[model samples]
Target: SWEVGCGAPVPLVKCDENSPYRTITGDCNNRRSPALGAANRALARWLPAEYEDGLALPFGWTQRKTRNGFRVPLAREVSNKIVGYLDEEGVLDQNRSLLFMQWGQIVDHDLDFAPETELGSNEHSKTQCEEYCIQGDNCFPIMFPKNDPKLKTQGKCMPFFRAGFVCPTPPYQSLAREQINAVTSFLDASLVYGSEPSLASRLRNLSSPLGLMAVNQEAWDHGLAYLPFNNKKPSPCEFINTTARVPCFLAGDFRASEQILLATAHTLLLREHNRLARELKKLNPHWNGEKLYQEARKILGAFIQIITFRDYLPIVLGSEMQKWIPPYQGYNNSVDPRISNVFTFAFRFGHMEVPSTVSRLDENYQPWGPEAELPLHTLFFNTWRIIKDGGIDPLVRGLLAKKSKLMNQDKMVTSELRNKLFQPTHKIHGFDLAAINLQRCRDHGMPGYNSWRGFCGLSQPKTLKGLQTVLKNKILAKKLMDLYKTPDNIDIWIGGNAEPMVERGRVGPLLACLLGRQFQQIRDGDRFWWENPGVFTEKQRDSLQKVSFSRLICDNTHITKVPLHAFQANNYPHDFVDCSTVDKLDLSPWASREN
Candidate 1:
């Protein structure tokens, strides 16, 4: 316990102030407190000047999107708008409630923003809460479910959302005893006789961030953090949903959505992994570390083979169904294991169910059914709908109804960009239509849709198979195409989904496989890609032939030593376009991951 307060060894508690070391060892405990506050939290924004016009092109460049996916605007864009986003809900809102853009409205439910939601208003700040706990001699801190009604009904604070910044303090010991007592008193005052009464009270009162933190303490901690296991202190609050008396909040609850999306995405991946594991058994049943490492390295390339934090984010945030958390950066990246806080409980709850190895192999690499798969038109409709919905939270029916405003009944397209796009194409491809025709513009960047234009070959680059129509409007699509088709340009065009490919012709399975192979080699600890081929050694050449995805999957059944090792090692880059040159491709031709 001496290490708990001192700063020398870096106590998990605050050491900067009291110098816990002066009193005690001041070692590990000092590090956990308020003495260690925010390390770095500069919210990135999307810049109109930088991204607006650029975004008009297909395959727009953006660091934020690569990291957080489409939920947020480009990093530069988000950086520019961070202050506005934070204050719009946190400060300006009547109750100082935290909120985020999702579906159609901002939700104050994301715990990252409202620490008070989990800890309670009495324990809003970390210092106060920790102080409260210290008074009781309870070394462990209490975390109320941020989104749970049980806590809210009890009048304790609970975190409801993920903040853009990392907590300067980890859980070991940053809070003070006073904060814990303050929260305990508040919880006792707000107690409800039955779970339903508690839940109903919380749901009604805990709408704003402050209200959420102040009222829903128990539900927030249990729901958001998923505590309540082992010898750990019993949750002061209880859950009472109509369906069951489970400790956790129900699925589809505002905040529970994040857990669902993440679970689904990972379950799919584990299924994929299990398939490879089975293959490895068949290929080298008796193989151990040495053989597996060499073959897997040859198969995996330089990357450490294992599930990554970024890959896990989608699934971690995903739930039993396909609902993904609205694009917020909390727990989104899968590279870090810290976000898997609730994985154990989630898997046990059946929120995450992976496909078996035999199933994956026999399913022919397509583990999900049609309902599970993402469709293009639906994605397109949704994208346009998201933009057109206008409000903070637009109803699905309302979003779908407003579609006509986006596309003119007569012209059937939104935005004046058509003339701009058609002109370039007509000049380069020598199409017969007027270069400045209105029909040339696209939603993301493809040609406008038209019932009549198809007959005239005016409806080009609109479908997956339609990009070939670039020949008709040779000037526009071809000009963009030529710039992207070079061997060097392949990286530029390959992106998240079929948008750029369908609109501009950048991504293809063959190209993806090649890049995957190259990426694999670099990941396997082969830094050769970072170096020039002139310096390539015989060892490097041999390593190169070993890591390609195709080589590992050959018959697409038994795993190759290389692939198996890659799986075990867990080394995959967060995003493919880490390459600067790759960002130049126009991605509007394609649509990305949508569930």
Candidate 2:
């Protein structure tokens, strides 16, 4: 029987205190042990040897090993038992039941802010705070009562926070050479290994074979998902040179083996992240399960940011670019072929990310325009498919236009997509927009290029260099995420040192609080992602997380008349009207009336 809490029926998994599983499995690492599950144990002790004689491992687990006999410790037995419970088939299959994955996807976006600001602050957990608080001896201290009321009331206690440990900021010189090799090898596994040999292999929808349904379903019969109608149909995700969102791989032509590979790769990424957390325990021997939870959240943020930032490539290119230089308005009277290619890329690679291969091919002087929707790779592939199949032409073009128009008008594009994107639609893809912009700003040597309006571009980027900077940022983000495989993206996320908030002789307690809340949730074993406004209670909290932008470029905004130096390409030429310096540049005139 399931337990009921806060209205919804919570799983009995939360309350099974004396079950045999608990005897073998360590208690959950959260503030409450009752909340623990396999996801929790993966953080607590999933890595090989982490629980026993792990001298050969990175974080130092084998101090008790002896030459005579390497007997299994109670801890090792407990760890193995947990793994068994997590993977056991027939009775307790974690594969068919994706409660963890489902829960993770839904709430990954909860954020923190400085309390002093009108924006609410998200408190960091004690675990996450340890990393930031100890960034330097000079870092702010975390205050906890000598006797914590919260702990006393709960009947179990731990320190509110601690300090004196720091993760090396990039240029992490202390990182072991073998560790780097291990990281690289894991990423390389994506191309060489598919999901089947992986633990995630069992999770696939194997009961139903792939592709056969396309022949049987009418939607697939006329839609681009079918290779027969492949390029002839117009697609929502399709643009000038791209593929549509409708998956081609799903059309059943793909071998079952290939599907398994993709699914496995997706699953392995999650497993690997937890493995890193377990290894880190050696370096911080003082860490308890809660502390381990905190650090994982902190490090995972960086990992997630790196990956999340890069993802903006295909998402923005395929989805948003069309609003500016739409295919219907172009010479072909269809979405740009580029859009098709990008969309197809999304269909194939949305779940599994790889370092992107940007096009060296010349647009051959084709009338190119500003980038939007997502990465160029995704846009390019999807657009190519639609064009090649002769699917997304003028007639199909009209349908997509309506959808984009509705999206722009803040109206629903079918109740579902509208809810997903507008109900402040979260989904992982949504949060990447903010991270990618910030990364671009950093790469371009442009401070605040991502601040407020820089990354989101109110008007087309005025300079080619600016546009290139944006693209370069996306590429870098992809490389990092592909490497780390962290998925902690939120629709609204902010990560920076205290320097931004603290002024000369002034402590930014709000900023400190923001970091505090984020750390606390992780310390307490909370993994809910806030992808949409619907998930949170207050409207203000949701609004704080939403990201929106607009561009205004017309004949009145052209900078083509300005000297190249006066209006550099790096300034986002796409958004400029006249770069004469003689005129004051306030793009307000071109602002959409609705905005």
Candidate 3:
């Protein structure tokens, strides 16, 4: 239908300075740069890219190494050396709940996902790059080491499709290869309302005069409906012999059903939107369907921003973030709000915090053995579990009560993620997440461990002994040095993971610095940021700030009780307060006096 072009064509979106609602495309947030941080926009590299061949080939793509005169170790080899399997009883976060990690993950998808190149080199060819194990266009599979635990046979490779390229400006001007950030960089809740207009329309309840989000009319619990069903002919979740292969649930994010808990998060927020729509309509009967929808959508999005800034970021960044970022002032047009390339890797930190098990609690918040507790992988792309079993409340309670996986020197990552994630290729061996991460870091040409340390204004380790000073784990420092030959060659992910946790935080100082810069920029650079001036009156802004995660969940779902602090893990009986104690969003400020 379209002619071949020199480079990908860009959309020219016009900014309406006074418009109340943000455009779904994510452009025009800044009137100056219309496409600055739009969905599908190229990610910004905080540091210069270090592509081995200066353009396309991955670092350590071959044996020869000119930079630092070192050859980076194979990704799989690095994964095998460092990552540990799930033990019967390893450490768990005493303070943070599994819900903390789950929310962080849901927020991550709202901000970023660098998708793989889907097609073969030949535009006309129907072949996908992932279909071939050997070298193919944009194919960079992780090769197995000899006598590998997963694959005993020689020459076996884990199939990987390289991240797609960003077409340079001027339609064909040459530039270093860049990866796409497939969603908006802002905290606008794109994952709930959707990033694209087509999907956004699909997610809305067109027939409803009330402007409510579409719900599964067929599925209900406690007199409320679940998220609408997706229309994939055969959803990937469809198992071999299941008589009823119901489709995956449609969400603002396509990967909504990747994990059932994530689907629960989507369900909670979707209902949150509909609840607001009904409330707003009642408050202003004169407001039309579209007005009610946008107003509620805007408020819901504001709640997401408040939750991130108020409840979530404090625990994630810790005191390290406070040192790095100043209190937000107002939107600065100079700030490029785009997500940093390093952030894509930083988001992977959630994988380390996920537990191997998915708990579906009984009515009293106690597990009923096999029926209630299941393997984490069993919940993937699974609507049957949510529907056949009790509704989202069980999972919601489970996530809130359960402790998150705590990372220590010995136990670094979860087995469910490291070994069996997606299980995309259950044939030979499933994908190793650690290897996939290392490969992605290299593919993006991200600066090595020492580079980020220097960027963060921290001491760079020259030798294994020096690494031990920073990491404080002598064994880990030595192992890293042995694998990488020097601290300078250490991949960015490994460096941050190996570092000791910062005081009162889930992440380390290095990660804190990078994440801090990203968040600071994200908040300040967003002109439509809920906190920004002219978007909302001072009273409205103050009310938005008071919106708590506990109250948000309380108002939306059948869950009658939640923790005083929803994300922080505490004893279930000790922390949970009745739904009555939760503060509702002070909808008083939003009450319109317009005729």
Off by over 4 Å in 3: 1-7, 65-67, 120-132, 153-155, 168-173, 423-429
Between prediction 1 and prediction 3, the one with superior lDDT is 3
Task: Pick out the ten consecutive residues of candidate 2 with the lowest summed lDDT.
Answer: 178-187
Listed per candidate, the RMSD to the true structure in angstroms reads 24.4, 28.5, 3.4
- Summarize candidate 1's per-residue lDDT along 1-595 as a digit string, tens digits: 1223223222233344432111111112123322211111111111111121333222222223321122212212111111011111111112110100111011111101112213323443544433243212112222232453323443332111111112233233332110100000000111110012233233222333121111213332112222111111221111112232233222112222122222121112222222333344455456543333223222221211212212222222223112222222221111111111111111111100110000111112222333433211122102111122221122211111111111011121111111111111011111111111101111112211222133223332443234434322333333333433321121111111112121111222222222222222212221122122432344544444333222322222222221222111121222111222221211121222344
The prediction achieving the highest TM-score against the true structure is 3
> Which regions in candidate 2 have their CA more than 4 angstroms from the true location?
1-7, 14-33, 36-245, 248-512, 524-595
Best by lDDT: 3
* Local error of candidate 2 at residue 364 (angstroms): 19
TM-score of each: 0.22, 0.21, 0.94
Ranking by lDDT: 3, 2, 1
Question: What tens-digit string does per-residue lDDT give for candidate 2 at 1-595?
Answer: 1122122112133334332111111122122333332111111111122111222121112336521232222211211111111211122111111111111121121110000011112434423423333322112222222443322442221111111111222222232211100000011121111212232232222333220111212343123222222333433333322333443222111121122122222222333333334455545445455344333333333333223222221122233332322221111111111111011111111111111111111112121223212222232223233323333222111111111110110111121111111101111111122122222211111212122122223322233344334323443334323322221210011211111222221112222232222222232222222222222235423332221100101111111322222111112233223423333212122112333
Backbone clash total for model 1 is 153
List runs of model 1 lying over 4 Å from the truth. Answer: 1-261, 289-595
**Global lDDT scores for all candidate models:** 0.21, 0.22, 0.79
**TM-score attained by model 1:** 0.22
